Amino acid sequence: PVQRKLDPNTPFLTGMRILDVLFPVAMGGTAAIPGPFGSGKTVTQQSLAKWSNADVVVYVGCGERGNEMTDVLVEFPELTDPKTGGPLMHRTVLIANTSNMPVAAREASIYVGVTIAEYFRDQGFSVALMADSTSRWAEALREISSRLEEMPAEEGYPPYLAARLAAFYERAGKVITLGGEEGAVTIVGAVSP
Amino acid sequence: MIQGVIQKIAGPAVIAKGMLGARMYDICKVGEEGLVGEIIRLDGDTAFVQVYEDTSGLKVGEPVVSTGLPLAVELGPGMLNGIYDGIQRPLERIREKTGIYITRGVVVHALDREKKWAWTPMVKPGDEVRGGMVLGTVPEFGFTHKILVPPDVRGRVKEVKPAGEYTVEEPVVVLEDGTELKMYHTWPVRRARPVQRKLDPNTPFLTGMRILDVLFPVAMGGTAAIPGPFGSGKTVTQQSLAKWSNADVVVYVGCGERGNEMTDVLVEFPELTDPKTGGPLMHRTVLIANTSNMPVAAREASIYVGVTIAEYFRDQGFSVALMADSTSRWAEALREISSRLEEMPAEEGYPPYLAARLAAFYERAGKVITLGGEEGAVTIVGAVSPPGGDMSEPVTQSTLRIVGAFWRLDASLAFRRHFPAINWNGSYSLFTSALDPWYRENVAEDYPELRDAISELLQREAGLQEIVQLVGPDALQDAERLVIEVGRIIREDFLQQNAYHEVDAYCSMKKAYGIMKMILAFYKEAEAAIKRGVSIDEILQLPVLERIGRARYVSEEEFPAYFEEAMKEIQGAFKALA
Amino acid sequence: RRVNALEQVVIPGIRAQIRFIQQVLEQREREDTFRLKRIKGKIEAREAEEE
Amino acid sequence: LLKKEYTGITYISGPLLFVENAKDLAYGAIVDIKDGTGRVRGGQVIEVSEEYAVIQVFEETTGLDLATTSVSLVEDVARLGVSKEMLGRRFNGIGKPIDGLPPITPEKRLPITGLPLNPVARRKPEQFIQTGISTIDVMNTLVRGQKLPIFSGSGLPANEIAAQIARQATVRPDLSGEGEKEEPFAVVFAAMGITQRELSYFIQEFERTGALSRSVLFLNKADDPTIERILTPRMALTVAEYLAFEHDYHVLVILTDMTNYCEALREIGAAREEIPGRRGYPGYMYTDLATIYERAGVVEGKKGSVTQIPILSMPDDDRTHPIPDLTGYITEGQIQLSRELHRKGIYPPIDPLPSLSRLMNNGVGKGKTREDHKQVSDQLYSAYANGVDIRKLVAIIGEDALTENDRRYLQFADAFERFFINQGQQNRSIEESLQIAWALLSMLPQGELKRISKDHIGKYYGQKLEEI
Ligand SMILES: Nc1ncnc2c1ncn2[C@@H]1O[C@H](COP(=O)(O)OP(=O)(O)OP(=O)(O)O)[C@@H](O)[C@H]1O
Ligand SMILES: Nc1ncnc2c1ncn2[C@@H]1O[C@H](COP(=O)(O)OP(=O)(O)O)[C@@H](O)[C@H]1O
Ligand SMILES: [Mg+2]
Ligand SMILES: [Mg+2]
């Protein structure tokens, strides 16, 4: 719970010219970055994790490769936090669920990440949340609905697929917390058609 | 065997009760009329059978009797000079007892049970026998038919029937354990016959046609596919291969062809003659014939009976060629059978396991050492008819991944009346390099380089087809016109073979080698004579070009004399004209 | 120039669209066959095993 | 240990059979099925309940009946007996010898499904592999621990390229500054859907090279049962993981055709009546492929490594088909063969534009191979992406638009396609491949080479063409 939701009025500085200039996203907004394989989604999300002005960064590896998450564990302690001067990994929380790990756990990771991001929002920080791929979460929903022998929607997905995505993206926004301070959550989610 | 009664009739599906003990995929006899059926289900005391024939008129309570065996064929003497349907029923003997229609429920035997055969034993009591051995010989037309112990039988012999005339039903050899061996044995059509060892392809399959033997060869034991749009010339090419190849036994499979074309091939074949011996051609061939109105289960089993018969004639040591008419209709029958069983189609309407069946059919071809110690080979040639013209049709796509040779035909070359209509820019073969050691050690040492020169010259002429499309061929350069005329000569006097023509339908290897040698010599000498700079336009009308075309129709026995004549004419023309 | 442009640009562009539409329609038919199977199975169960 | 048999078969249809009183069968267990004739078949429990258990049969169900069929449990988890003596041997798709030699003596029995690696336990791939092909080694280099599939069409020499890579690939330790020392290199070769003409070619090439003494072959013919096609690559990966992470080997794994694996997967799923996917393939294909490709990599504190090079054939130039698409989302790059380069005679026909290596930046640079590798790769790539567009525009308009420097640049592009990409059956080292690239680089002025620094120009520029 919160008190109020406010209109975003400050930019979310990502450090990339085309995204910061042509297509800005505000502190508390949402964004989606679709594309085929080998396009540049993961590198963009990792650059946002390195160079953004958010205080706390939560990274959710829903159903992707393991080397892409090992790179984060190796490289990040050797870098520098842009706004505090310490190690970069001291502000970052990782939720990892690779592609060969159990399928039903993909649904839990998204909710765990968004719950942690909301928790750090209540303390007055500015949180940036990155989801590696929501299409894997959709595939997990498809498999679970297939086990229940439910009637499918287009392309076999369950008909309540859009409601879950609406309930996930709605958690972002700049709010006034119950304690009186001001926090914000911004969500950038990659889609894999 | 187990006997039961009917408790449900719904279309071609019949549910029987009391059938506890029946096995899957067995052949059952349904009703008082005796219709054949196949069991595909088991549930408690009941089993689901699927009737091949028409079920109209059946009543609940009629008996069902199981034969205890799956679909199988009878292998033995009497299969040559015969015509069979998809499940091995003799069409000639049915017509004798019934008429011009095929009444359902008729019972006939694949092998004539009342014909006497001469028997000559080759074993004595006290011997030990194992599956695949030879025990006895029987004369049959120009062949000698060998009696084989079935592959699944081993034992010790103490009984020999002496030399005399017996029917195939009479036992000839009785083993110590009570096993009686006859002149025939059964074998399921969907289980491949065992072999000792599978060999590599090292000997060519002599098709008798110049372009197929030289440019796109197939080895003994290989597989080839000949696709193309309708009206291309597949059937005549397959018949020419059946007539003139070096294979000992030919098997022809009709997978559901049109009635009039089946009548055409049924009438034409008895009039043909065997080129090896001069007798009728049907004395060495076995025909499997189906039309479009036959039961759909008989159409699916057509290609398995033929390949099982071909494997049987392989075990005796002969070389077998298996020609199969268009497998697209066989795939259509398979699709219909799958739709009868609700199999959730995957590709277009085809079942997901079409490629597995096609692979299982094509993998039986090969050169092997039989269980008796002899060597035999089986070659499979199949036809495809993609309706869309493009080779992206699912059956063609599945076939392209498991074949070694690919003889694509084109309809446009048929409109120009250039036959055979082989597209040399789309066809390919993967057997050239392996056949190269055989070629140079037997035909000639310079044969592969000469063949590569011919193919290179054909490739060069295809690169000039753009310039001909803008400007006329007369405005082209003298050397370019030279190579264009050489390509035209090569095409019209080397790649042409008319099949309806009486002496244009066959070509040996030595004739082709001599023609290629003459063509290369003429090309090289004319290329030098162009830079010689004398009569450069009159080079195209030299009298040597008559000798080049004359070698197409020269007899093989008269061929060396005309070869010397043409070579010395090339010498006397190019060396001493000017 | 016009011949080369038509040969190299327009025809494969139309052909790809034709292929895409064919695949979509075939996938829709494959989807509805599954629903027909499910409703046939539901018809069989309730009309033969209830009491 | 005592055995148990269940004879309560109640329903047989297609590939499935139902056993009534078998409550003590574990989920996913492996059973053997024996009928009245004594023939033994295989099966797996796919669904178990209180009323009955569902078992699918590995092969055809011909000859089975409800009167004499009995089902006996083999083991609860499908396991493979592995040993160090398997090097030099050949196995079928289920792990039995086919060479006629006596069967091995197992050391351990490992589950073939494996276990997921802990992301904390992995480490970053960093060591370069010299394959001998200039297009691969320079522009799309391969790193120990990578999974880099080869995208091929129908009628292209994928098998010959795979054999050449198997023959020529090794790591040179002296180039890395660590000093020269021998390292144990092994090859695990898995083949499925392979016809006899390809099987003989692979066996003959391996015997002629002499590489059979250090390789293990898993071969599955096209007329074999389709369950062995599913179970073939898992056993090869189980052997490779055991060797690499328990004997410090460096193992290179080649999967000959994944298109046949996907077709066999489609055949199995469609008989179990579940919802299909994009082109009839099952919807869980991504997870099933991920359980195969993700088993490679390196482990912290261990000297071993596993490298995968799958070969798959696209149905067309269709990059959007489900099989190469879902392969692209899991793997770390692709090497794509070009039909245009094959048509004009270039061998091997690797097209640099759709190709990509995602771990190139970690295995190149200062201290590894040579310090000019990345600069040379950038300079070699810098021409093609604009030269191809120039050639496309010329194919419509003509030669009128080209200037003189553009003519030089297109001549360099033609010489590039004729010399660098085309090498035939060569065995180039990385040093001589760099020398050939630099000899091509000396055909352009130093002022136009806008990528390489002038330190590298001052010590490598000016070499004339070497392969003539
Ligand atoms: N900003 C960039 N600068 C340089 N190279 C880049 C950049 N973005 C992407 N690349 C290159 O393209 C590759 C794309 O990798 P990336 O993980 O970003 O792709 P992706 O779209 O997430 O793919 P996938 O769906 O397969 O996970 C990188 O490995 C790198 O080689
Ligand atoms: N070698 C040949 N000589 C003469 N005519 C040929 C030859 N090959 C093909 N044709 C012609 O091609 C046509 C197609 O013949 P056929 O094989 O019966 O039909 P399809 O090609 O559709 O199976 C025939 O009319 C025949 O005249
Ligand atoms: Mg990614
Ligand atoms: Mg025809």
PDB file of N, CA, C and O and ligand atoms in Angstrom, chain B residues 230-231 233-236 257-258 261 325-326 329 385, ligand 4:
ATOM      1  N   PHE B 230       3.834 -32.469 -64.156  1.00  0.00           N
ATOM      2  CA  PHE B 230       3.130 -33.470 -64.947  1.00  0.00           C
ATOM      3  C   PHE B 230       3.349 -33.239 -66.438  1.00  0.00           C
ATOM      4  O   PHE B 230       3.403 -32.100 -66.909  1.00  0.00           O
ATOM      5  N   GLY B 231       3.492 -34.335 -67.180  1.00  0.00           N
ATOM      6  CA  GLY B 231       3.825 -34.246 -68.586  1.00  0.00           C
ATOM      7  C   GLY B 231       5.299 -34.103 -68.881  1.00  0.00           C
ATOM      8  O   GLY B 231       5.658 -33.613 -69.956  1.00  0.00           O
ATOM      9  N   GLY B 233       7.938 -36.749 -68.444  1.00  0.00           N
ATOM     10  CA  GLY B 233       8.583 -37.904 -69.039  1.00  0.00           C
ATOM     11  C   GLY B 233       9.136 -38.920 -68.062  1.00  0.00           C
ATOM     12  O   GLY B 233      10.037 -39.690 -68.412  1.00  0.00           O
ATOM     13  N   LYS B 234       8.616 -38.921 -66.832  1.00  0.00           N
ATOM     14  CA  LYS B 234       9.102 -39.844 -65.811  1.00  0.00           C
ATOM     15  C   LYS B 234       8.868 -41.297 -66.211  1.00  0.00           C
ATOM     16  O   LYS B 234       9.784 -42.126 -66.133  1.00  0.00           O
ATOM     17  N   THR B 235       7.651 -41.614 -66.663  1.00  0.00           N
ATOM     18  CA  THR B 235       7.260 -43.005 -66.878  1.00  0.00           C
ATOM     19  C   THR B 235       8.082 -43.657 -67.983  1.00  0.00           C
ATOM     20  O   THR B 235       8.507 -44.812 -67.859  1.00  0.00           O
ATOM     21  N   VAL B 236       8.321 -42.926 -69.074  1.00  0.00           N
ATOM     22  CA  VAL B 236       9.089 -43.490 -70.177  1.00  0.00           C
ATOM     23  C   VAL B 236      10.540 -43.715 -69.767  1.00  0.00           C
ATOM     24  O   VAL B 236      11.155 -44.713 -70.160  1.00  0.00           O
ATOM     25  N   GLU B 257      -1.893 -45.362 -59.402  1.00  0.00           N
ATOM     26  CA  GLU B 257      -1.916 -44.614 -60.648  1.00  0.00           C
ATOM     27  C   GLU B 257      -3.316 -44.609 -61.257  1.00  0.00           C
ATOM     28  O   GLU B 257      -4.212 -45.343 -60.833  1.00  0.00           O
ATOM     29  N   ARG B 258      -3.494 -43.757 -62.266  1.00  0.00           N
ATOM     30  CA  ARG B 258      -4.761 -43.693 -62.982  1.00  0.00           C
ATOM     31  C   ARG B 258      -5.026 -45.006 -63.705  1.00  0.00           C
ATOM     32  O   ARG B 258      -4.094 -45.733 -64.056  1.00  0.00           O
ATOM     33  N   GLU B 261      -3.579 -45.249 -67.433  1.00  0.00           N
ATOM     34  CA  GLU B 261      -2.125 -45.382 -67.485  1.00  0.00           C
ATOM     35  C   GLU B 261      -1.676 -46.746 -66.971  1.00  0.00           C
ATOM     36  O   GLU B 261      -0.710 -47.327 -67.485  1.00  0.00           O
ATOM     37  N   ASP B 325       6.524 -46.000 -59.043  1.00  0.00           N
ATOM     38  CA  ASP B 325       5.738 -44.895 -59.570  1.00  0.00           C
ATOM     39  C   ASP B 325       5.414 -43.944 -58.427  1.00  0.00           C
ATOM     40  O   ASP B 325       5.577 -44.308 -57.257  1.00  0.00           O
ATOM     41  N   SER B 326       4.932 -42.745 -58.778  1.00  0.00           N
ATOM     42  CA  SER B 326       4.910 -41.556 -57.926  1.00  0.00           C
ATOM     43  C   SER B 326       4.521 -41.823 -56.478  1.00  0.00           C
ATOM     44  O   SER B 326       3.443 -42.356 -56.200  1.00  0.00           O
ATOM     45  N   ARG B 329       1.209 -40.128 -54.334  1.00  0.00           N
ATOM     46  CA  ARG B 329      -0.068 -40.787 -54.093  1.00  0.00           C
ATOM     47  C   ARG B 329       0.015 -41.763 -52.925  1.00  0.00           C
ATOM     48  O   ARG B 329      -0.966 -41.932 -52.189  1.00  0.00           O
ATOM     49  N   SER B 385       5.932 -36.084 -57.703  1.00  0.00           N
ATOM     50  CA  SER B 385       5.152 -35.160 -58.524  1.00  0.00           C
ATOM     51  C   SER B 385       4.696 -33.993 -57.655  1.00  0.00           C
ATOM     52  O   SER B 385       3.549 -33.971 -57.182  1.00  0.00           O
TER      53      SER B 385
HETATM   54 MG    MG E   4       3.242 -40.381 -65.365  1.00  0.00          MG
END
